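Field log, afternoon session.

UNIT: design team B
ACTIVITY: writing a sequence onto a fixed backbone
BACKBONE:
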């Protein structure tokens, strides 16, 4: 049981208004044939156009919500909506484009999917709330066959060109006109009572229904994301490396050791309350402090209420010392805290749009993160950049331009001139810090944090 069997049953109740008289008994095999596609008993890596929920979760980077609304069905013009906000109108002869034939519409579909997916995935997954028109319209822009490779590279083929009879991935498909071997999943097959808007609005207030095809496409992918990543969580599923993942994660570990070590030197807290990761390690292992851990998994729905995490009767007094919340998203942080909060609004290849203002952050694992709220940090301030080192000024073993910086907190800078070792280390740390901030993470600290207090750790 790897793929979705074509002999599985497809509930056709949701299809009978666009398609009256549809057989209640339907299989994927028969539905595909009804859609105008000939699978021709092909044992070449594309066993089914439709996929399982497990396969869709593993390929979430490829999800594109798709909806078709019949404006006037052979004689009538269709509105093609995608979760990218695009609305295309096809004639048979929230970006709303005017009526054009299928030969030009398919050119736009390939360009749009390619520009959206080239840096995220090796495929497309049309996430549907199937009523009929979207499945019947697929023959006008989709071609199927064996699994292929690109005409210009080793990546799998996702596009086809009738002009040249060639195949291409999302990176090399300029001027291609057909979507090749796409995937799809119908959310209605999951078992819902009622229409799309009623199920969507149960969990999300950020997406509305302007009554265009793209609005339903968005609500569809959002409802799919809530079901697969908000209400259900699976942090065991690994995801491929598609960007700066390894650099971002290494930067996060360097920043955390730096920021926490400096707070313990500047304010010498006797106890640190580490709230978050049940698998956490002491990020400053040589520190004197009483390190106490508290387990809390990443909240995917709503941010943790500080009352439920702390109270109900540990040192008991979280007011003693400092509380470290490294990616532990709470509604309002206590004033004595060190905090790393992921900003869900950040635009990147790792951050996919989520449910109720939240986002799906995919870095090794998929983490649905609640909406970034600036009010969570009223008792704290933004942590400013600084680099601190108490290592000896020894070069050992790139070239050099003298470093002049007020934020290089070192004995050499105290003494008047940054040594080459600390200048290399400072610039490497500044790069790691910038990496992490640009990845979307934000750093917050208690209002009394002052880097001026670190100069006296050199006596
Ligand atoms: O980057 C991460 C994972 C950090 C690791 C972790 C944090 C808290 C509990 C268990 C594990 N996230 C994205 C932002 O929201 C929070 C989770
Ligand atoms: Zn290619
Ligand atoms: Zn939504
Ligand atoms: Zn030095």
């Amino acid at each position: 049981p790897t793929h979705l069997s074509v002999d599985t049953k497809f509930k056709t109740e949701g299809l009978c208004v666009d398609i009256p008289g549809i057989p209640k008994d339907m299989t994927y095999r028969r539905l595909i044939s009804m859609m105008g596609f000939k699978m021709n008993y092909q044992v070449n890596g594309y066993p089914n156009m439709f996929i399982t929920r497990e396969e869709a979760i593993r390929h979430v980077r490829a999800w594109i919500g798709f909806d078709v609304e019949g404006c006037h069905g052979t004689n009538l013009p269709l509105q093609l909506g995608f979760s990218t906000g695009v609305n295309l109108v096809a004639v048979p002869t929230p970006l709303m484009y005017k009526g054009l034939p299928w030969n030009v519409v398919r050119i736009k579909i390939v360009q749009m999917l390619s520009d959206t997916l080239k840096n995220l995935s090796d495929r497309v997954v049309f996430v549907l709330w199937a009523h009929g028109f979207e499945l019947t319209s697929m023959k006008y822009f989709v071609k199927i066959g064996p699994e292929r490779t690109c005409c210009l590279c080793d990546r799998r083929a996702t596009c086809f060109s009738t002009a040249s009879d060639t195949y291409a991935c999302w990176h090399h498909s300029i001027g291609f006109d057909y979507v090749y071997n796409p995937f799809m999943i119908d959310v209605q097959q999951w078992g819902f009572t009622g229409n799309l808007q009623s199920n969507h609005d149960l969990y999300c207030q950020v997406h509305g229904n302007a009554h265009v095809a793209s609005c339903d496409a968005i609500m569809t992918r959002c409802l799919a994301v809530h079901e697969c990543f908000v209400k259900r969580v699976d942090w065991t599923i690994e995801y491929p490396i598609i960007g700066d993942e390894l650099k971002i994660n290494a930067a996060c570990r360097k920043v955390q050791h730096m920021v926490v070590k400096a707070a313990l030197l500047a304010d010498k807290f006797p106890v640190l309350h580490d709230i978050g990761n049940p698998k956490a390690i002491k990020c400053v292992p040589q520190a004197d402090v009483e390190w106490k851990f508290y387990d809390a998994q990443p909240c995917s729905d709503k941010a943790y209420k500080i009352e439920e995490l702390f109270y109900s009767y540990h040192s008991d007094k979280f007011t003693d010392g400092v509380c470290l919340f490294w990616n532990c998203n709470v509604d309002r942080y206590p004033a004595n805290s060190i905090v790393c909060r992921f900003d869900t609004r950040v635009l990147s290849n790792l951050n996919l749009p989520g449910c109720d203002g939240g986002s799906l952050y995919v870095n090794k694992h998929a983490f649905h993160t609640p909406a970034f709220d600036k009010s969570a940090f009223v008792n704290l301030k933004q942590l400013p950049f600084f680099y601190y080192s108490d290592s000896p000024c020894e070069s050992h073993g790139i070239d050099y331009v003298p470093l002049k910086s007020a934020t290089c907190i070192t004995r050499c800078n105290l003494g008047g001139a940054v040594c080459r070792h600390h200048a290399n280390e400072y610039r490497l740390y500044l790069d790691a810090y910038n990496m992490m901030i640009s990845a979307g993470f934000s750093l917050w600290v208690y209002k009394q944090f002052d880097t001026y207090n670190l100069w006296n750790t050199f006596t």
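LOG NOTE: The pocket of 1-(morpholin-4-yl)-4-phenylbutan-1-one (ligand 1) is lined by residues 276-277, 297-298, 327-329, 342, 361, 367, 369 (CB under 6 Å).
NEXT ACTIVITY: expression trials, pending approval
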